[PDB]
Amino acid sequence: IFGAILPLALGALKNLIK
Protein backbone atom coordinates (compact mmCIF):
# COMPACT_ATOMS: atom_id res chain seq x y z
CA ILE A 1 0.00 0.00 0.00
CA PHE A 2 1.42 3.44 0.95
CA GLY A 3 4.70 1.65 1.61
CA ALA A 4 4.53 0.64 -2.02
CA ILE A 5 3.07 3.82 -3.47
CA LEU A 6 5.33 6.28 -1.66
CA PRO A 7 8.55 4.50 -2.75
CA LEU A 8 7.24 4.03 -6.28
CA ALA A 9 6.59 7.76 -6.60
CA LEU A 10 9.94 8.47 -4.98
CA GLY A 11 11.47 6.67 -7.93
CA ALA A 12 9.24 8.18 -10.59
CA LEU A 13 10.68 11.41 -9.27
CA LYS A 14 14.15 10.20 -10.12
CA ASN A 15 12.70 9.32 -13.51
CA LEU A 16 11.75 12.97 -13.86
CA ILE A 17 14.84 14.80 -12.66
CA LYS A 18 17.71 12.41 -13.49
Side-chain angles (χ1 to χ4, degrees):
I1 189 24
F2 320 114
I5 88 186
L6 290 169
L8 182 87
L10 241 297
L13 171 75
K14 271 86 174 44
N15 199 348
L16 245 173
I17 173 182
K18 293 91 131 56

